[PDB]
Design a protein around this ligand. Sequence first.
Ligand SMILES: O=C(O)c1cccc(NC(=O)c2nnc(-n3cnnc3)[nH]2)c1
Ligand SMILES: [Zn+2]
Ligand SMILES: [Zn+2]
Lengths: 327, 316
Amino acid sequence: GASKLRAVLEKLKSRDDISTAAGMVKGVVDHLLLRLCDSAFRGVGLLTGSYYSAPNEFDVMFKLEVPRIQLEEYSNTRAYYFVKFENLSQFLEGEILSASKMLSKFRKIIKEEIDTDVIMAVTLLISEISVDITLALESKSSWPASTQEGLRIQNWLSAKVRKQLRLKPFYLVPKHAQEETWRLSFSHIEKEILNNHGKSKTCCENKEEKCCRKDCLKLMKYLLEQLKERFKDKKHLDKFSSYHVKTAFFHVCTQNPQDSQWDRKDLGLCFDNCVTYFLQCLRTEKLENYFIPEFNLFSSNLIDKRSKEFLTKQIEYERNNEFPVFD
Amino acid sequence: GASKLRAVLEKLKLSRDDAAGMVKGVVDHLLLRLKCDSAFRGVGLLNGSYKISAPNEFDVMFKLEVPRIQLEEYSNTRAYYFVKFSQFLEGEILSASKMLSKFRKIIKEEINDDTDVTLLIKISVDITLALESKSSWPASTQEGLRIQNWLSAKVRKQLRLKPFYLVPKTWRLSFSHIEKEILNNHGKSKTCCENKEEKCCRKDCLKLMKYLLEQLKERFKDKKHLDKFSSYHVKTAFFHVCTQNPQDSQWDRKDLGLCFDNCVTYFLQCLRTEKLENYFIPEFNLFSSNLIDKRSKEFLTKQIEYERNNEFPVFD
Ligand SMILES: O=C(O)c1cccc(NC(=O)c2nnc(-n3cnnc3)[nH]2)c1
Ligand SMILES: [Zn+2]
Ligand SMILES: [Zn+2]
């Protein structure tokens, strides 16, 4: 029953509709970067606008190079940190850097340069299409000791690649934990190891090496969004996001490191295994962050078992009926 | 027969411990005095080590980013260029003679602060200055670096967005950085030579053919028939065979004897047909009659054919 999934893939490929709309966004973003003329946002750049069933919604991240940072871990929560440190000290509240103040001037300088308006990091609605903008510090120092045993790809993309990827800078993003904390972000690494997906360097570059990894992730996200929309009336699925399903997908990738276990003929079986693993994470309330292995996205402190037991029930019914949410 | 190949591969690994700290400190220190001068302000050694049977001889390159540069090719050579962009502009062109003189002059000054002058210390490291250009690579490289069936097209695109380097010789193309990259990341699989199940003999094949040429260059040191051949020819031919043999299973270290034989065979086909294209500039034949004459190739050919016919007595 894999043709119904490829029929979904066929309809999912809204290909030109996102291509023509991204040009309108490119102007707004390029017309946003010049105005942050600010001393505070001098070295601000971006991180190819992403688009996680909604071709009219975008999210771009604005990198801000911050040199000579030093991080204090919050409270054994290995993903949230305080930031310490030719000098810029407006938001420097004592020694910790005020995330709320630093985000306020970011919202302020952006609201000045903006049928384009702003909603309550930053979302806008141009020409009636929305763009989420995110502020991120860049630290070219070594990755925090909380990441050392994460990104277990040595058996899949090789240890030589993992050492190379950990040479790259990491990113911190304002995110409360109960406030004034920044969270570790490796979205750039996620982009890297998704477009260089295979164990073979020529994977998917020829008909004999066509795998179904990207297609499995796309259906995982599509399944979640469809059910997130179907049950919009209640809020049981509001705490789930495509970051969870893509983190689970990465754990299936390190579990099945060979390209032979991802042949496009076995798309139905491979996707069935991807759905099976995501359900196991739901029931056991365990899905470690791919880069911070001690950070549990599915801990009871973040999502309650009632909402996971609801998501599990919906997915189990879907798999047992050839996924009607696709119809 | 492959037992003898692994024997010299073993003896070639014991001569590696002796060593690279003295070379590293002197190259580090002299880079500070280079930033003293404005012309060398952005200068920087590019990755530190370097014949193979000569452990006391190194070769370093010094990258100095020259920006916003227009290259115009010297009369269809497709590999030598004039650098049209202020101490060394003879005309509208620059001058490697004036650049290297200012290089060798500034290089001379700092040295006198037990090292003579290529700086002999015993060991003697050779230094090379390279122009860096982050611009798109010249059109002569358009059909070179044919690795899309071996290391994929994505890797080829990623390598070509890296800068290309020019070296005084007119200035000639140099892709030594790209050579090292594909050498230590050599397999179709990313875990090639990283586990017991995916162990290839590509690197061993390159070391053997280099040791093959150097030893015969030493044996016939007086005949002057092989002094024009260099390890860059061996490595260039090795890359072509890697293109001809993309799959890692065609490089199983179970078949080191056959893999090395297939390497010397291709190298001999280049010597006989007098064609060895530059791996990056396919229209630049290193084995041309204007460079190496036929008598030298025929002598090198005959010497390798006898060697392979007798299980390489030079490897003793
Ligand atoms: O040109 C020759 O026939 C020749 C013969 C012997 C030695 C060298 N010189 C090098 O050691 C070299 N190292 N890289 C290159 N190279 C790069 N792209 N084209 C040539 N030559 C050149
Ligand atoms: Zn693939
Ligand atoms: Zn290998």
